[PDB]
Each structure stands twice: as structure tokens, then as C-alpha cells.
Design a protein around this ligand. Structure first.
Ligand code: HEM
Length: 291
């Protein structure tokens, strides 16, 4: 399977910066969602789940085809709760009907990270919608009740190494787990709609307790009202993972730089860009534009 990026006809940077601005403006406007967390966290989880289906062995899945719009993928039990992110983006797709679905879902993740004052994420356009029969089957996304060996093996399918996995997991500082979506409940820290390295700091400094929640699943809970998934706590149980957790807890700029590289790679896996394709765009935030 080869997937060649094809720029939406006649579009350039200025067109995609208008779409970025439309998403950022609605993120600011619809601030009441999920007890005032806002839509930022569910939009970076949507960009990760539409990319996270990729398989390096046969180049199936991934963000290219925008197949989350089809019933099979939209209804995946692992995607429970992401309908809220799709509904947020639906008015913006009506306003810019020329953007492909893969490009809009991946750009929603980029916009959310940057507007929640995370690092700049370079982004490339050119994903092309593919037919319903190219939709990957359910079951390619990760379980939360496992250990470090499972996380390591799982991310080898997306060819992410240990460093890329630990950097990507720092996004779990954002938003919260919701009992009715996943069978887990609670936030991972106090700043859950501002992008920071707090996930690493909490993992190493909190006093965690293994408890059972109302859906009968075990999770790690702390005196401060925070929680961590079994796969999250994995990162301090493994010696290789633990030393990179300590590095990001002690250097927030290195965490931002490594996250940016791994998140762009996640969103681009499976796509072939021609050498006459445009360079990655770096979008300005609303704040840098005085908007
Ligand atoms: C082994 C890897 C991972 C597992 C098992 C996992 C699992 C989960 C689960 C169970 C939730 C809660 C869903 C809900 O109840 O609403 C969640 C939320 C979230 N995850 Fe992951 N995740 C993984 C990796 C990642 C990565 C790599 C990213 C992003 C780069 C990410 C971003 C998020 C975000 C932002 C949320 C919060 C969503 C919200 O507030 O609505 N996750 N994760």
C-alpha cells in the first residue's frame, strides 16, 4: 500500500491558517464543555486515535484516508467519547468543505496543542479521503490495563521507540478519563487544559495507591484527587522508561521539543510526500496574531 499526499487544489498556507483560526476561535468560544476543560484534550485524543490505527507492516490504517467518518471506525469501543470531537469539527468542515477529512482531524490536534500553549507542531497537508472499504477493523488501539512490556510491543507497530513513547504519553496530563467512556475515572493533575510536563512530575512526586473504581477496574489514585492508568504507571516501573520520565520532569523544553517531533511523526506515518510537495507549515497562534 502506497499513499501519496496530494495538496487540496490551489490551496496554500493562507488557506490552512484560516482553518486553524476557525478551530482556535471555536475552542475559545465553546469553553464550557466537560466542566470547563474545553475541547482541547478530546481533539488531541481524536488526532491520536485516527493515526493510531496504522500498521508499519502493510501500511494500512493511519491518518491518510480519514476513515473515522465511516461507521465501523466511529463505532469502535476504543473511540467511545470522540463523537464529541467530531461534532465540534463538523461546523468547521461545513465552512471549509475543500479540506480533506484526514487533514481536518490531524489539524484539530495540532491547533489544540498550540492553543493550550504547547510547542509549535509542524504540519503537512495532502491527506486524501479513501473509500469505506479501506476502514481498518476495530482492535488496533491500545488497552489501558496492561504493563510496560505491552506498551513497548504495542508501539513498535507504529515504530515508535522508548523515547518517542514516553514523550507522546505526556499528553495524558490533558483532560481526564471518564467512567462511561473507558471504565476509568479522574484527572491526572491540576493543569488539565494547559500543555505542561506535569504528567512526569506527578508520576514521580505523588503517593499513588492501587484502588478499584466504580466500573470494577483498577487504577492508581493519589491523595490529591489525581489518577493514573495501569499503562501510565508502567512508565515508572520499567528502568528504561523511568530514566526518560526523570529527564522530562527535569527539563520542560526537551519534553516540548521531543513531543513536537513524535506527534508530527505519528500524524504522518504511512504517507509518502513527493519532493515537490510544500514544506511543513508552522501556524501562528491566535495570541501571536493579536486575535
Ligand atoms: C498505551 C497508550 C494509551 C492508552 C492505553 C490510552 C488510554 C486512554 C484512556 C483509557 C483515556 C480515557 C478516555 C475517556 O474515558 O474519555 C485516555 C484519554 C486521553 N488520551 Fe490516551 N492512551 C494512550 C496514549 C495516548 C497518547 C499517545 C495520546 C496523545 C498523543 C493520548 C491522549 C489522550 C488525551 C488527550 C486524553 C484525554 C481525553 C479527554 O479528556 O477527553 N493518549 N487515554
Amino acid at each position: 500500500l502506497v499513499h501519496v499526499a496530494s495538496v487540496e487544489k490551489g490551496r496554500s498556507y493562507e488557506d490552512f491558517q484560516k482553518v486553524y483560526n476557525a478551530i482556535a476561535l471555536k475552542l475559545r468560544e465553546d469553553d464550557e464543555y466537560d466542566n470547563y476543560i474545553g475541547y482541547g484534550p478530546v481533539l488531541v485524543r481524536l488526532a491520536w486515535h485516527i493515526s493510531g490505527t496504522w500498521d508499519k507492516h502493510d501500511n494500512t490504517g493511519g491518518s491518510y484516508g480519514g476513515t473515522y467518518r465511516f461507521k465501523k471506525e466511529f463505532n469502535d469501543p476504543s473511540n467511545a467519547g470522540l463523537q464529541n470531537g467530531f461534532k465540534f469539527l463538523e461546523p468547521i468542515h461545513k465552512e471549509f468543505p475543500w479540506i480533506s477529512s484526514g487533514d481536518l482531524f490531524s489539524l484539530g490536534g495540532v491547533t489544540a496543542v498550540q492553543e493550550m500553549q504547547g510547542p509549535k507542531i509542524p504540519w503537512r497537508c495532502g491527506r486524501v479521503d479513501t473509500p469505506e472499504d479501506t476502514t481498518p477493523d476495530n482492535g488496533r488501539l491500545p488497552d489501558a490495563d496492561k504493563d510496560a512490556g505491552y506498551v513497548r510491543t504495542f508501539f513498535q507497530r507504529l515504530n515508535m521507540n522508548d523515547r518517542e513513547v514516553v514523550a507522546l504519553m505526556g499528553a495524558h496530563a490533558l483532560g481526564k478519563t471518564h467512567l462511561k467512556n473507558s471504565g476509568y475515572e479522574g484527572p491526572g493533575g491540576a493543569a488539565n487544559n494547559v500543555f505542561t510536563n506535569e504528567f512526569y512530575l506527578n508520576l514521580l512526586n505523588e503517593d499513588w495507591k492501587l484502588e478499584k473504581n466504580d466500573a470494577n477496574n483498577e487504577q492508581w489514585d493519589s491523595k490529591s484527587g489525581y489518577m493514573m492508568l495501569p499503562t501510565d504507571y508502567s512508565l515508572i516501573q520499567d528502568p528504561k522508561y523511568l530514566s526518560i520520565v526523570k529527564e522530562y520532569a527535569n527539563d520542560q523544553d526537551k519534553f516540548f521539543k521531543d513531543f513536537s517531533k513524535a506527534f508530527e511523526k505519528l500524524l504522518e506515518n504511512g504517507i509518502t510526500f513527493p519532493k515537490d510537495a510544500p514544506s511543513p507549515f508552522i501556524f501562528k497562534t491566535l495570541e501571536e496574531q493579536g486575535l
